[PDB]
RNA sequence: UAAGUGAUCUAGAAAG
């Protein structure tokens, strides 16, 4: 479930090894973003080809 | 109603304090709160938060809490079913990880009570960190939880219990006595 | 709004806009006396942890005294006082190695 | 490719989510954790200092910055406060930007548009202690307790993140319902209200309940912290009440004591499910958006009361962390039971598992329902449910869950029982 | 440059708040200090001495108006808060002057350096911020003195020194101290 | 100091930042005025005598 | 040795 998923993600982030250490300047960057218009800019030919693979 | 007509524990605590019930009834209130906590399916931070708020507020409330605790492990612990008991233990652990002083009064006394104790220990571990927790325990007088004196293989039982729920220092203690 | 804390306006809100100050607030404020325990523990954990100039100063003082004395008693001329002062300085130097 | 493969595992035995066959492999690459959610990707990069510097340099080369306008035009999370939100250090800010740029470069714009206005980059460092991000409607602030000043009493809303090896509650993660979700909720409320000049008060009430239940069951723990959401709830609830009062062409506050709304339908009331009688956290709005915060001065909440404490739906919903922990427990227990049965040679009875019956995720009871064989073939169902939004006019407000695969994740009969009590008992009503 | 630090006498300070030989005499009258110190002294705003050994022989330490200018800057903008210094002595211990002499560098260098030295001295001497205190007068009626007392208690620094009875009237002219 | 909003309306232009259309308040003397309720005439009752 | 004082929106009639 989405909340469950979120929780899992959080756990993972905590459970990454040496993730919170900042002694040697270990900079962790969390990037989040939307893939904008990802549905709106599929070409059908390419899509078809991709499908053919699977 | 107050407990349940309140978003965070903090709010609930505030509401309770508004009432300004006599130093007589504080214990009763605490008991009620505990019961409520037990009733909920699993341990909630809310109740713990409320307790903390109460505890900070006044010495009488602290006293009441202590009394309640005493009542529990002594006379009211064996009555509860397992999940409820576990929840209670967790709550107590939370209370004790920070707010309370580690003061604890613990062969014969081992069914429900032992499991409650185990639960509490687990909670403590979760909150603190194992070695740190151990250190903290050492710092307080603590004769009941970990009796230091060998006392003719009476500590063996305790060691066994500890082993049953992943823990350290027991072995060391055993070594010490021989 | 009272101490920056009340709800800006009673309208809209859809509520009384009443404001009980909390008694958790007090608790939050207070545990530096009662957090305090933690601090104490921390403290416990980390709890265990020129002569030449003086001489010079003394010499200076002595010189000053000498000067004062000179001023007091027959030393309108500079050479005398200066001489005596110099001698004193020399003596001081001798005394300190 | 290689990184992706690593993430997957081997084909013969692939990894579970965010697990790796070794630690060394995990360490090797800069990226650590990935998850796309429904075309909203989440990448956790973990750099060393040297690595970071190079990236920064590259970024600078790409796009010179003499006046220092990288902190300006940078997506930071306004919901959080200025201290706890991502601090704008000339290293950290630059690093995030560089990362974003790199990511952009990696995909052609023609295939998909990865905009800076869409994106967010939190950066954990020596100078930034709050790893922030918005997932699924939650806003999560992961703040390690080693970085935290005084490791205060765990609040409600906060998930204590746990280290799986040592079992230590090693970090905290504070939650807030993301503003978008709040907005959505508001919209829903409006919809409910609008197009309801007729409706049987009761229908409206039911709708409201449904809305409210969806809101609360989705973010149980994460409501408490967000004050805006609370405010909206208060307002929304009031609006709903007034709708009913609009029908009765009055809204005189005495003529509708909470009795008539919250009393269940089984005593003739509307049977609303309030989340409004909460004393909302007020705070120094001077120091709230700015800097740091604490819960002081409660605001009114919703109504004049006759000291009638109407219980609140939240206290009858088990906060998400608790639920997850419970799930972890009882699934293990279930497994153990199964093992025991196997050892003894038996079919595991549903009467023995009673006690942990309505407890877990999925609810234990999802095993022993009398129509399970077919739902095992319904795979890729959650996604389908989610995508329902685009097929249907009025959608499900409980897209996130699904009763058949999960079991009832909430139960609110207790609440019903207690509301009556709160309202004096039956006689009073 | 090496400069020392030590607080002046409280009474002396108070006096200050409210010809070399003459100055020396005055100093003696005030605190009963040594005469050499008095001779060397040359203060502003607080106290600045020139009390090493070799300065009386040396001509580098002689002509110290420019030097004292530098010190003034230090006094203006101290070490702790970049906020002004108060109730402090500054006696020189030794001065690292090179053989090569140029008027542009010698003075300019001293200017920063003196300030730095002062700061160092302050650091050494167990520095402390001094806040001011308002002297207060309140003129309550008779029966509200307890209220006033309570208020005072509630504020951090506070002292009711004396509750002077304003004759022929209800008023209790209460002298006070409260930090600004 | 907590800077109470009591203090805002007392020294508006100071304690409050960006005050607008704010009028200036008064800042007064104390009123020692004693009225006899027991039907007596010119008496130092509530206060105390001079030293000399 | 010191908790617990106060902040309380509303408010109906016509036609459609
Ligand atoms: Mg018409």
CB-based contact D228:D328 (threshold 8 Å): no
- In C, which residues are within 8 Å of B17 by CB distance? 23
Q: Which of D234, D300, D302 sits opposite C19 (nearest CB)?
A: D300
> What three-state secondary structure class fits B173?
helix
Token pair recorded at residue D300: 């009114």
> For G10, which residue's CA is nearest its C1'?
D253
Size of interface C-F (CB pairs under 8 A): 9
C2 touches strand G (CB under 7 A): yes
Q: Which nucleotides of G are covered by protein (CB under 7 A)?
A: 1-14
Q: Does the C-beta of C17 come within 7 A of strand G?
A: yes
Strand D171-177 relative to strand E2-3, pairing: unpaired
Residue corresponding to tokens 């690093």: D95
Is the dihedral angle over the CA atoms D270, D273, D278, D282 positive or is it negative?
negative
Q: Which of D36, D48, D177 lies closest to D124, judged by CA?
A: D48
Asked whether at least 3 C-beta pairs link D and B within 8 Å, the reply is yes
Task: Determine the residue among D16, D32, D145, D174 to mutate to test chain A binding: the one whose Cβ has the most chain A Cβ atoms within 10 Å.
Answer: D32
**C28 CB and strand G closer than 7 A:** no
C1'-nearest nucleotide to the CA of C10: G9
User: With the CA atoms of B17, C38, A14 and D91 taken in that order, what torsion angle do they form, in degrees rounded to the nearest 10?
Assistant: 110
Q: What's the rounded Cα separation, in Å, for the pair D166 and D156?
A: 24
D297 to chain C: which residues are within 8 Å by CB? 5-6, 19-22, 25
Query: How far apart, in whole angstroms, are the C-alpha atoms of residue B156 and residue E60?
Result: 83
Task: Sort out which chain C residues have CB atoms less than 8 A from E41's CB and list them.
Answer: none
Q: Does strand G come within 7 Å of the CB of D374?
A: no
Measuring CA to CA, which residue among B66, B2, B77, B6 is closest to residue B32?
B2
| E168 contacts on F by Cβ (under 8 Å) | 44, 47, 49-50
Answer for B60: CB within 7 Å of strand G. yes
CA E61 to ligand 1 center in whole angstroms: 103
Resolution (A): 3.8
**Six-digit token pair at E95?**
């001065």
Contact of F50 with E167, CB cutoff 8 Å: yes
Q: Which residues pair with E138 in a beta bridge?
A: E174
CA E162 – CA B124 distance, rounded (Å): 55
Distance CA B111, CA B165 (A): 15
Cα–Cα distance for residue pair D429/D159, rounded to 1 Å: 40
Q: Which two tokens stand for residue E14?
A: 């108070």
C-alpha span between F8 and D290 (Å, rounded)? 21
Say which residues have a Cβ less than 8 Å from residue E102's Cβ, sequence separation at least 6: none
Q: Is the CB of residue D138 less than 8 Å from the CB of residue D219?
A: yes
Q: CB–CB of D170/D163 below 8 Å?
A: yes
Q: If we measure between CA atoms, which residue out of C5, C3, C1, C25 comes closest to residue F4? A: C3
- Quick one: which of D145, D135, D150, D101 has its CA closest to D33? D135
* Nearest nt (C1') from C6 Cα: G7
Q: Cβ of residue D424 near strand G, that is under 7 Å?
A: no
- Reference B53, options B98, B84, B93; nearest CA is B98
Give the CA distances from residue D235 to residues C14, D24, D89, D207, D396, in Å, rounded to whole numbers and listed in that order: 5, 53, 39, 16, 23
Nearest to B68 by CA among B107, B111, B25, B125: B25
């Amino acid at each position: 479930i989405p909340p469950l998923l979120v929780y899992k993600w959080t756990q993972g982030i905590n459970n990454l090894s040496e993730i919170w250490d900042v002694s040697r300047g270990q900079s962790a960057v969390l990037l989040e973003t939307t893939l904008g218009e990802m549905a709106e800019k599929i070409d059908f030919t390419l899509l078809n080809r991709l499908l053919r693979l699977i | 109603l107050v407990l349940k007509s309140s978003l965070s524990g903090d709010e609930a605590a505030h509401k309770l304090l508004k009432l300004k019930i006599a130093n007589n009834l504080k214990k009763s209130v605490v008991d009620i709160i505990i019961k409520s906590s037990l009733q909920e399916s699993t341990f909630s931070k809310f109740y713990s938060i409320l307790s903390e708020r109460m505890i900070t507020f006044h010495r009488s409330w602290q006293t009441a809490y202590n009394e309640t605790f005493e009542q529990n492990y002594t006379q009211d612990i064996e009555d509860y079913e397992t999940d409820q008991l576990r929840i209670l233990g967790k709550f107590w652990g939370h209370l004790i990880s920070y707010e309370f002083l580690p003061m604890d009064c613990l062969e014969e006394s081992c069914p429900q009570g032992r499991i409650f104790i185990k639960f509490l220990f687990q909670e403590l571990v979760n909150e603190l960190g194992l070695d740190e927790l151990q250190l903290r325990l050492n710092s307080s007088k603590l004769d009941g939880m970990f009796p230091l004196e060998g006392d003719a293989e009476h500590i063996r039982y305790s060691i066994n219990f500890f082993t049953a729920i992943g823990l350290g220092l027991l072995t060391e203690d055993m070594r010490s006595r021989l | 709004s009272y101490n920056g804390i009340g709800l800006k306006s009673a309208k809209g809100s859809s509520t009384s806009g009443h404001v009980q100050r909390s008694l958790a607030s007090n608790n939050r404020r207070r545990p530096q006396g009662s957090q305090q325990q933690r601090q104490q523990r921390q403290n416990a954990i980390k709890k265990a942890s020129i002569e030449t100039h003086m001489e010079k100063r003394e010499i200076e003082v002595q010189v000053s005294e000498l000067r004062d004395r000179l001023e007091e008693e027959e030393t309108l001329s500079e050479e005398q006082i200066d001489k005596k002062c110099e001698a004193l300085r020399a003596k001081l130097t001798n005394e300190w190695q | 490719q290689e990184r992706a493969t690593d993430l997957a595992g081997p084909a013969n035995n692939p990894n579970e989510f965010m697990q790796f066959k070794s630690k060394e492999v995990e360490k090797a690459h800069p990226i650590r954790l990935y998850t796309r959610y429904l075309d909203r990707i989440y990448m956790l990069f973990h750099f060393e200092e040297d690595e970071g510097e190079e990236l920064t340099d590259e970024y600078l080369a790409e796009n010179p910055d003499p006046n220092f306008e990288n902190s300006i035009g940078y997506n930071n999370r306004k919901c959080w406060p200025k201290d706890s939100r991502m601090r704008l250090i000339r290293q950290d800010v630059n690093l995030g930007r560089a990362v974003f740029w790199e990511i952009q470069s990696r995909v052609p714009t023609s295939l998909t548009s990865i905009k800076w206005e869409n994106a967010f980059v939190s950066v954990y460092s020596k100078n930034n202690p709050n790893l922030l991000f918005s997932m699924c409607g939650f806003e999560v602030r992961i703040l390690p307790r080693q970085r935290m000043e005084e490791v205060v009493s765990n609040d409600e809303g906060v998930w204590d993140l746990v280290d799986e090896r040592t079992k230590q509650r090693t970090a905290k993660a504070y939650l807030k319902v993301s503003e978008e979700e709040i907005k959505k909720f508001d919209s829903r409320i409006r919809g409910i209200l609008m197009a309801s000049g007729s409706t049987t008060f009761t229908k409206v009430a039911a709708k409201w309940n449904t809305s409210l239940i969806s809101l609360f069951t989705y973010f149980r723990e994460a409501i408490v912290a967000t004050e805006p959401l609370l405010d909206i709830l208060v307002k929304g609830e009031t609006r709903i009440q007034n709708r009913v009062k609009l029908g009765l062409n009055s809204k005189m506050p005495t003529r509708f004591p909470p009795a008539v709304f919250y009393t269940p339908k089984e005593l003739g009331g509307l049977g609303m499910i309030s989340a409004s009688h909460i004393l909302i956290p007020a705070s120094d709005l001077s120091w709230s958006k700015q800097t740091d915060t604490g819960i002081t001065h409660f605001r009114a909440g919703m109504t004049h009361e006759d000291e009638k404490l109407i219980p609140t739906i939240f206290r009858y919903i088990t906060t998400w962390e608790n639920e997850f922990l419970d799930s972890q427990r009882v699934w293990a227990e279930y497994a153990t039971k199964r093992q025991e049965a196997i050892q003894q040679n038996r079919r595991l009875a549903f009467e023995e598992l009673e006690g942990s019956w309505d407890r877990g995720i999925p609810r234990i009871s999802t095993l022993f329902q009398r129509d399970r064989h077919t739902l095992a073939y319904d795979r890729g169902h959650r996604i389908r449910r989610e995508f329902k939004q685009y097929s249907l006019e009025r959608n499900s407000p409980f897209w996130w869950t699904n009763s058949h695969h999960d079991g009832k994740l909430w139960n609110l009969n207790a609440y019903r029982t207690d509301v009556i009590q709160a309202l004096g008992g039956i006689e009073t009503i | 440059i090496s400069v020392a630090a030590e607080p002046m006498d409280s009474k002396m300070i108070q006096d200050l708040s409210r010809p070399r030989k003459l100055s020396k005499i005055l100093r003696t009258e005030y605190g009963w200090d040594s005469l050499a110190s008095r001779n060397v002294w040359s203060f502003y705003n607080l106290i600045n001495d020139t009390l090493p050994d070799e300065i009386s022989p040396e001509l580098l330490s002689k002509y110290k108006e420019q030097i004292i200018q530098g010190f003034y800057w230090a006094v203006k903008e101290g070490p702790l808060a970049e906020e002004p210094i108060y109730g402090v002595q500054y006696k020189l211990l030794s001065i690292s002057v090179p053989s090569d002499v140029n008027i542009d560098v010698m003075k300019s260098q001293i200017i920063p350096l003196m300030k730095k030295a002062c700061y160092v001295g302050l650091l050494t001497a167990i520095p402390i911020l001094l806040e001011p205190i308002y002297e207060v007068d309140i003129t309550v009626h008779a029966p509200l003195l307890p209220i006033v007392e309570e208020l005072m208690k509630k504020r951090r620094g506070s002292r009711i020194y004396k509750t002077i009875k304003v004759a022929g009237t209800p008023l209790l002219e209460v002298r006070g101290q409260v930090p600004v | 100091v907590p800077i109470r909003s009591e203090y805002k309306v007392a020294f508006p232009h100071l304690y409050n930042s960006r005050p607008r259309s704010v009028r200036i308040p008064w800042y007064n003397n104390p009123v020692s005025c004693i009225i006899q309720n027991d039907e007596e005439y010119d008496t130092p009752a509530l206060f105390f005598d001079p030293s000399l």
